[PDB]
Amino acid sequence: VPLPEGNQLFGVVEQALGAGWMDVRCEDGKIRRCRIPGKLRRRVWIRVGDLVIVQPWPVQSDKRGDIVYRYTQTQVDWLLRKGKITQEFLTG
Amino acid sequence: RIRQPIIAVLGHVDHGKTTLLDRIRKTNVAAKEAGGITQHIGATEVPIEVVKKIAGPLIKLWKAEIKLPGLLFIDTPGHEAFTSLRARGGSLADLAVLVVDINEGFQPQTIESIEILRKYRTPFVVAANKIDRIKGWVIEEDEPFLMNIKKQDQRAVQELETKLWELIGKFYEFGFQANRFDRVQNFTRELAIVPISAKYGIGIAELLVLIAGLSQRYLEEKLKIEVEGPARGTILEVREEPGLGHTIDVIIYDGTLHKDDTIVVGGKDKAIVTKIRALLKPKPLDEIRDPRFRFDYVDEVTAAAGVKIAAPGLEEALAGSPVIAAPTPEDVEKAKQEILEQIERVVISTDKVGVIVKADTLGSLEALSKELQEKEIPIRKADVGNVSKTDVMEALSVKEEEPKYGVILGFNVKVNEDAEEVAKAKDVKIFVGNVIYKLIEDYEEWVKEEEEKKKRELLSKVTFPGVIRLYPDERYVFRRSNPAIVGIEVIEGRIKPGVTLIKQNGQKVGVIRSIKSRDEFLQEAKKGQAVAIAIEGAIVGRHIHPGETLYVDLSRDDAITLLKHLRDTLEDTDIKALKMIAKVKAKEDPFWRAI
RNA sequence: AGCGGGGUGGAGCAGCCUGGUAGCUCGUCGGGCUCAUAACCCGAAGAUCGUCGGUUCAAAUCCGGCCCCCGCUACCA
Ligand SMILES: Nc1nc2c(ncn2[C@@H]2O[C@H](COP(=O)(O)OP(=O)(O)NP(=O)(O)O)[C@@H](O)[C@H]2O)c(=O)[nH]1
Ligand code: MET
Ligand SMILES: [Mg+2]
């Protein structure tokens, strides 16, 4: 339900790299090696192909970022119906 | 006991401000400086004896005395950047001399000087230079205008009359009534215009006697000072000296100043209290900022005079702040309360992310800061001193995240051995200079050169777009495989060797091996040119068909660079080709769908 | 361009030559075994043969025309 606020933007998980590292495709047509904060790492399980919010790192904000929130099925369905995001971004 | 009145000279660039003072002193200073412009304010004392020698029988026309001990002249830059120096000179001095060239008329600096004089209610008399520019004028060494006028013809006199009439009319729409010194009798609302010649000393005596005489008419009671009271003066500048440390040059005008007296000076953040250690005095008839002769140390000085004070802990002194003598703690508190009623005329705005600039005085730093701020350039730090090692470290720290803002601009300073070695090792650029514009323009042009070099090598990396169509003609096919030799006409874009071609479905037909319009070897083909391509990996039929349209494979980074960086070198055919290529490629990646 | 070879469940191969059931291994879905997963067992779905025509009592099998794929050679702007 919460939306990106600032430099944050959506993203689609592509492949997990191990040791809490994911490979997320963002809305600006860039692939980023993203790091999962440990606070939500322990309680929220993330799997390839999900809509998430990613904030790029302050330095070298082109290939690194942090994942802050995961969108459930109802939230992504509501977003698709509202029209803030399209279907081809999710499906690739 | 009457103190020497303080006279401030104001005017525009190249209007003979320094030359008049040089002629009065009979010394050459105007040729010393670089660029012909004086960027430092100074105070000079003129003894009354040379004043009397310069003058003559004219002193007997006015019923007064020459009991004035002397004169205290202050020079002032006329450049646009040094506004604060002009303001300080206008506020501090008791009398002003505006020097305006007759030929050029009026300049914005003259208007600003008049505005400052009106704001600080300083009476003044107008001077006129460049008299020799009028044709048919004879030159004689040091004669008054009254003696010179009879030596000229009617044409020069009438031209002079017209020019001064125009000047008086100008002052009139500036709301000021003007009349010639020998052509007016009122001396409370009417000014006086003295036509002078700096290069040949014409009319200097009239101006000198007028300055001597007008002092006691408007206000003379302000010129009486007790010779035993506490010292009271103001700061003129703050500069570094070899062997003495941070010293300040001040003009004492109240009381008497002795050595070891405690003084109160308004610092940047709060008042500072220190004990005087060294009192230094310039030689008579010598510019204070030009130490031609050796300074004479002096135990005590009496108002009014310009002296250099060397005391500990003066590195945070504010230019223009007053100095008050205080021998007792209650006097110290009263001086602190007096200082608390003082405003900082100029404050620098630092953005914490900017360049590092260092000068030798506070006024030069203010001028440089204003000139940089006029061009929208942030300033990380401004202070007084030579370029040290930590400055290079700070510059490297700023450069780490901003290539164009890590640089040092030194204005009349020195670079240490360790600092220059570290700068050479870590490749940090330093621009040293003595002239404000000659120093700023160098930085601007270096920034422009770096900017152009940023994209000079970027062009070679990207690949131009291109769309072509095979001839439906059998003739153009000259070899089928290894290599495939077939003619082509260009629809849009530019063909280059070593560029991959793809179809709508994106099959790798290979890489163009060679292009030839004839038996001769070619390099590239532009719009409306036919060329036979010899390509590898392409075979007629299964891989390519006659009459089929071929597209150049494009890199998305190259497309972004073309649409954002190299947007100047894009024309109709190129943009049409790139747009339709994006439309075609909008099949798998939504990036081309959104273009 | 000329010559030669081949198209069969989602994938890779038999079934031709000698016409008359369309099989083999992997893969998907469901149930079994185990505390659970993999391995293993059971059952079921899935091609009507690249299209069109000729022949024959009857054609994936014999024949011919097209569509596509693969290989070899000639082929210098
Ligand atoms: N022909 C002629 N040239 C003059 C006369 N007075 C000065 N000049 C020349 O004109 C120039 C004036 O420069 P300067 O002495 O700097 O003027 P200023 O009054 O100090 N202005 P600033 O220091 O800001 O430029 C010099 O080159 C000087 O030789 C004059 O009466 N006649
Ligand atoms: C080479 O033979 C040449 N005439 C083929 C066509 S060039 C466009
Ligand atoms: Mg000058």
* DSSP result, B360-405: SBHHHHHHHHHHHHTTT--EEEEEES-B-HHHHHHHHHHHHH-GGG
Q: How far is CA B264 from the centre of its chain?
A: 33
Q: How far is CA B341 from CA B337, B348, B411, in A?
A: 7, 20, 33
Q: Which residues contact B414 (CB under 8 A, 6 or more apart)?
A: B386, B387
Structure tokens at B319: 């230019």
Q: Provide the edge-to-edge strand list for the sheet that holds A64-70.
A: A11-16, A21-26, A31-35, A64-70, A52-56
Domain extent, residue B70, equals: 6-215
Query: A75: left (phi > 0), else alpha (psi -120 to 50), else beta?
Result: alpha
Distance CA B449, CA B339 (A): 49
- Contact, B406 vs B395, CB < 8 A? yes
Please, which experimental method was used? cryo-EM
Largest CA distance in chain A: 36
Provide the sign of the torsion angle of the four alpha carbons B53, B59, B65, B71, taken in this order: negative
Query: What's the CA A90/C1' C10 distance, rounded, in angstroms?
Result: 26
Q: Which residues contact B53 (CB under 8 A, 6 or more apart)?
A: none
On strand C, nucleotides with any atom < 7 Å from a protein CB are 1, 69-70, 73-77
Pairwise CB contact (< 8 Å): B556 & A29? yes
What is the number of other CB atoms lying within 10 angstroms of the CB of residue B554? 25
The continuous run of DSSP H or E covering B440 comes out as helix B436-456
Q: Reduced to 3 states, what is the DSSP secondary structure of residue B458?
A: helix
Q: How far is CA B130 from the centre of its chain?
A: 27
Distance CA B177, CA B172 (A): 6
Q: How far is CA B407 from CA A49, A92, B353, B395, B426, in A?
A: 47, 46, 12, 6, 12
Angle at B146 between CA B145 and CA B150, to 5 degrees: 100
Query: What's the CA B543/C1' C55 distance, rounded, in angstroms?
Result: 39
Please check whether strand C approaches the CB of B533 to within 7 Å. yes
Query: Resolution in A, one decimal?
Result: 3.6
Amino acid of residue B167: L
Q: Provide the edge-to-edge strand list for the sheet that holds B6-11.
A: B43-47, B70-74, B6-11, B95-101, B124-129, B193-195
Distance CA B75, CA B30 (A): 12
- Contact, B189 vs B123, CB < 8 A? no
Q: DSSP character for B264?
A: E
Chain B residue with Cα closest to A26: B591
List residues of A whose CB lies inside 8 A of any B CB.
29, 59, 86, 88-89
B-chain residues within 8 Å CB-CB of A86?
A: 590
Q: Which residues contact B523 (CB under 8 A, 6 or more apart)?
A: B497, B515
Q: Write the CATH number for B145.
A: 3.40.50.300
- Contact, B135 vs B156, CB < 8 A? yes
* Ligand nearest to the Cα of B82, by number: 1
Query: What's the CA B195/C1' C4 distance, rounded, in angstroms?
Result: 113
Please state the domain extents for chain A: 1-92
Provide the sign of the torsion angle of the four alpha carbons A73, A78, A79, A81, taken in this order: positive
- Contact, B111 vs B132, CB < 8 A? no
Q: Is the CB of B77 under 6 A from ligand 1?
A: yes
What are φ and ψ of residue A16, in 5° steps? -85, 135
Buried b (16+ CB within 10 A) or exposed e, B100-117: bbbeeeebebbebbbebb
Q: Which residues contact B450 (CB under 8 A, 6 or more apart)?
A: B403, B404
- Contact, B235 vs B214, CB < 8 A? no
